[PDB]
């Protein structure tokens, strides 16, 4: 637990969209750190799959109409 989940978002280029997503994720009960790989069109959340659960993270992004796709790596490396 407390690991990295990778995400990609179909509109990373939309500047403030990532900043919105950051904040949104930041609050969530299990997120220790937000996404940032706008640079190349990825997102990297430090998440804690006990409370939150990875699909709920993905849902959270999709709420603002963003086509999120999610790559959970492993529960800790």
């Amino acid at each position: 637990n407390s690991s990295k989940c990778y995400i990609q978002v179909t509109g990373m280029t939309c500047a403030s969209c990532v900043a919105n997503i950051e904040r949104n994720l930041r609050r969530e009960e299990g997120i220790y750190s937000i996404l940032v790989a706008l640079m190349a069109g990825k997102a990297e959340v430090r998440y804690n799959p006990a409370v939150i659960q990875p699909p709920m993270i993905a849902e959270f992004i999709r709420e603002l109409g963003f086509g999120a796709t999610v790559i959970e790596n492993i529960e800790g490396r």
Side-chain angles (χ1 to χ4, degrees):
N1 240 261
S2 276
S3 188
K4 287 188 161 205
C5 176
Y6 273 38
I7 326 183
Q8 303 198 248
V9 295
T10 62
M12 57 99 180
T13 18
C14 300
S16 320
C17 286
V18 156
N20 175 25
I21 294 163
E22 287 175 48
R23 292 290 199 79
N24 294 337
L25 268 57
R26 222 273 181 196
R27 287 184 132 285
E28 243 287 51
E29 197 177 297
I31 288 176
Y32 281 89
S33 186
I34 76 312
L35 79 306
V36 52
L38 202 174
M39 298 90 73
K42 279 126 287 290
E44 176 183 90
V45 64
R46 181 184 153 196
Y47 76 120
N48 188 91
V51 179
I52 191 168
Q53 303 298 328
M56 296 187 175
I57 309 185
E59 295 272 315
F60 229 106
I61 303 172
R62 285 156 42 222
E63 291 294 283
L64 56 131
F66 264 42
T69 182
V70 69
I71 306 180
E72 187 172 26
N73 294 280
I74 179 162
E75 216 210 311
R77 277 191 65 187

